[PDB]
Symmetry: C3
Subunit: 356 residues, 3 copies
Amino acid sequence: RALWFAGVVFCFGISAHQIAMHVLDYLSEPVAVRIDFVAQNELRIPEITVCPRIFQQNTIFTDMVEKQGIDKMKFLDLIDRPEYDIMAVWNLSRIFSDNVSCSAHEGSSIISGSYVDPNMSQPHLVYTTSGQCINIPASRPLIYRGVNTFVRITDSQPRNLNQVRPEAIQIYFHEHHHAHLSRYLTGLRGYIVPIANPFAFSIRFTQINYANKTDSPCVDSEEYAACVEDFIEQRIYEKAQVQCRLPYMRPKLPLCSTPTDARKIFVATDDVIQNFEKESSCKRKCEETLYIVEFMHLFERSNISIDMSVYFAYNYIQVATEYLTYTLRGLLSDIGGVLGLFLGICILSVIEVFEV
Amino acid sequence: RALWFAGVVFCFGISAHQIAMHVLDYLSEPVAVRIDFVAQNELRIPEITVCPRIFQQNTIFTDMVEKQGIDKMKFLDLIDRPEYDIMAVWNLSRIFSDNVSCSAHEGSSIISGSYVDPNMSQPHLVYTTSGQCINIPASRPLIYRGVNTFVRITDSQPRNLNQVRPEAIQIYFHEHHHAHLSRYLTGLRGYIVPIANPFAFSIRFTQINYANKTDSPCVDSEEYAACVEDFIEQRIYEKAQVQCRLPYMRPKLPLCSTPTDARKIFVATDDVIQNFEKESSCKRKCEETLYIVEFMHLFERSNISIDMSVYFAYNYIQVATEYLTYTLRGLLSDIGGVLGLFLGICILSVIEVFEV
Amino acid sequence: RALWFAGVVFCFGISAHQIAMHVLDYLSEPVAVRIDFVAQNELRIPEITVCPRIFQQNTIFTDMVEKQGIDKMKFLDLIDRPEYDIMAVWNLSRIFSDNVSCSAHEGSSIISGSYVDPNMSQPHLVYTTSGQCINIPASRPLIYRGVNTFVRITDSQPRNLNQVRPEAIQIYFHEHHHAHLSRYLTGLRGYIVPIANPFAFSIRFTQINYANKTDSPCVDSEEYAACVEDFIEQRIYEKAQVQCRLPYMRPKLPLCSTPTDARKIFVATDDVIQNFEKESSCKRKCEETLYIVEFMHLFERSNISIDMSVYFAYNYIQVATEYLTYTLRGLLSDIGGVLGLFLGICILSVIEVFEV
């Protein structure tokens, strides 16, 4: 009976190996991606940060610093003079007046006309590494009534001919409550547009709903934003080796009073915002919206200085949803199948063996 | 033997529960989406409806009604005068003459030159809520030979300087035989372009082949179009509480002779076309083509009044096909697996039990 | 016992059919597509071929041939004159001087400024069916630092006013080492742009990683390129029935000395490049990158003759990966399940039967 026992042990070994592999596969939680094209009646506007060009590319700030006798690429030296402070050095980069309106034109009606909703999340002041910027929270989702839906950022500043006036701005569309993106990466990930002519963008939406797993955990939008903001600030402070902050930093430490400290912080933040995408520690989000930006063309030319439009005309959002493809039912079915192939013992056999 | 019987009944219960869940899963027909990027040698042109701006935004119609002493936003009062009829009130919005050509430039040949096919589904007259419009059926699929493939809608109307001439039109790309889209939603879902300069669009194709299931049934394109058109017409008639029709309606009832009836129908159709997307009853289609519209730029400037181009330069259509992921073979395999785990009885055991 | 034996044979038949179908399904290797949106820190630039317009659409070449007394559409007759050769007839179509630079602007730094890398794969000379063209190999992947990443092809040729100067060129973005695409299909699949104004494109990336299967085998990029190039050349030679080559052909046979041979080769290559997509024999690649081309707008206007830009501002590449969904473990589990349903015999029963 030696051969029969050898066959029995071989069958037990193969069955044990197969059940172990099945259980490991279930534990790994394999996932599959379902791609849908969902048409919504209300689009979630991305948060918009409109900055001036970076300090070096900015024309007004560069002209001011040259007028003060200090060449660009080293503007931070302005902090040395008692009449200039970092807050003032960064308020000099302001490009939008107090008359900044963010209208929301949601389609049109064949009987009444076009809907205009000027009371749409009026822009507020933010401090970016590019200077002083305008942030536009997405207070409510825009009702999509047609390809005429858009958001119009318009500033009618008294653009007199006495002084040189801006030739470009940097507009960045990002997640709703990502303070780090608005205050650090607008200068890098913001599309440059001229204000001389009324511009118009177009936004398509690719939503990605990842899956929360043991090896790829999730964090809500707030958790991810807080994680990345804290990581960026702590990394900047570690790199700069200084107790400081700059207008683009949370009120944690006091502003620098000397150019050296500010320049060290600036270099540190440059390196961080450059290399933080891969070296960040906190986990990804599983509600990740991508705003594909195309370039519309405007037939209507307005006389407002900084007329700007962003059109949301495509309501078919591409939703990529990740779902678990292996369940407990499937694992039990596969285990029972392998048993019926190799061992051929149900739980009744186990009960009989245990009793005896 | 009480404990053994308790174990037997517990095993039977768990096996019954698992088989019931497996059968329910199979009955629900779970589906999976396969995303392909298919390159075709012949592109299916979308149907194009070119309208004037909506009656209020239209400049020629507004100027005419003001010349007649009636301000816009209430133009329907024109029906009161015996010399004006609704058909005439809507023929006043015509913007394209009888000389409207729809050429089809399908790539080019390095030896012969560019292929021009002027005999491509010449535009015909349609009546939209925007007025009198030009509809261009897709008679045949355009042969894709390169990024130079496009369809050119050109009208050389005698645009004399005596009278104000149009500054914009509304072009809507939609499914092939969707009369409701052409005659109701062009004013809402149609991109506005100026005729002063030769325009050019660009169309990318996202085909979605859904699956016909018990809980998500299908209907052919004709069935869906007929359903939605009948629903829109019936809902407009229910809302307006009047026996009427307007040029943008099928020849079912006669045209109104009084402004009140026409205005009631107009309000009803506005509300319908606004809210019919979600409250429609008939089932969706599972051959659903999406036309992503980008904005090309034309280096060549022509002297024709309403020169217009639509380029189909990307032949990689994104096909999202939905297929059933659970089959009868799989269900039987899973049921047998759970039996081999818990019960360990094949059909032979069933035969033996039945005989005894 | 006849009924019992009939039931046994029926169960054996159904089980055999089910196991055969399961094994056939496993052998067919069903596949599933996973769609990811991967954000990279370095983008792989597509290879760029910038040609003049096709010989007929080209203005400089057409003007030259008309000046020589030979009308276009038959320019090959120039070979008849001893003072003209095919190499000279195709060097007459040159549009770019020796001062062609391909700079690579990879984002910008808030402290240092914009990164410019003029030493990025300087363009070299290629011979296309469109004439003499400029090919730009992708030496290295561009580091993506922001939406300001782009590649600038700039030629400052001495564009004097004495002679007519080019009004358009044809720029084609294709796989890295696809010589056939560069030398044959640029005139067909190349976007036409004017040089009078500084142009700017925008490239989005859709990578497709197909699966190598018995019924749909794979070939590396080099293998596919070599296959298709050899197929195109051999098919052209078979069709033209002549021992020749043209500047757009590999140095295999000598150049024609008579117009008839060159014209026959030209017609043959036209037909080939037209119809080779479907009638090609060698297998597809499973690393297939698609370059979706949108149209950017440039706010800055330069004075260089042929200033041209291609922006890579979207780093979220859409990766469609094809993976096998049925494995050996799954097949064994399903086979065991069907056995436990119908037969109820493990391998131990097989051993017992074999011994007895």
